[PDB]
Amino acid sequence: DKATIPSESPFAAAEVADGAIVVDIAKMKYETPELHVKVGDTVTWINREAMPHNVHFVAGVLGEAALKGPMMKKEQAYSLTFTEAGTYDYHCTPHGFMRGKVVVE
Ligand SMILES: [Cu+2]
Ligand code: NA
Ligand code: NA
């Protein structure tokens, strides 16, 4: 696999340390749609609105299987640690027009 999952379930935004790497989700967009990190970094999505969203990497991207994150309600967070260099696309399962990508170097 190319990523591990710190928490299978969504968790409180407030637990995210200031300075952590964060992709915000507001107004039906991933607010940082092309994110550059380094191998080993933890990326955290935080949902800033009431419409639930997730991040969804299709089969083959982060591993054999799809990685379909849990739906996040308002002020909930979800994280993935990227363990291998490359570029990984993802979208929001119910909102397929919402697309982003992580570039791991
Ligand atoms: Cu969504
Ligand atoms: Na995947
Ligand atoms: Na997580």
CB-CB contact of 2 with 83 (8 Å): yes
What's the CATH number where 90 sits?
Answer: 2.60.40.420
Number of domains in the chain: 1
- Backbone phi, then psi, for 80, in 5-degree steps? -140, 135
User: Does 56 count as an annotated binding residue?
Assistant: no
- What is the maximum span of the chain, computed from C-alpha positions, in angstroms? 33
User: Does 36 count as an annotated binding residue?
Assistant: no
Sheet containing 56-57, strands listed edge to edge, beginning at the edge strand earlier in sequence: 34-37, 99-104, 86-91, 56-57, 67-68
Distance CA 10, CA 79 (A): 8
Name the closest ligand to CA 55.
1
Experimental approach taken: X-ray
The resolution, in Å, is 2.2
Range of the domain at 90: 1-105
- Backbone phi, then psi, for 48, in 5-degree steps? -100, 0
| C-alpha distance from residue 54 to each of 38, 46, 57, 85, 105 (Å) | 22, 9, 10, 22, 24
Write the DSSP symbol of residue 14.
G
- Cβ partners under 8 Å of residue 105, min gap 6: 36, 37, 38, 39, 85
If we measure between CA atoms, which residue out of 29, 55, 27, 59 comes closest to residue 43? 55
Name the closest ligand to CA 88.
2
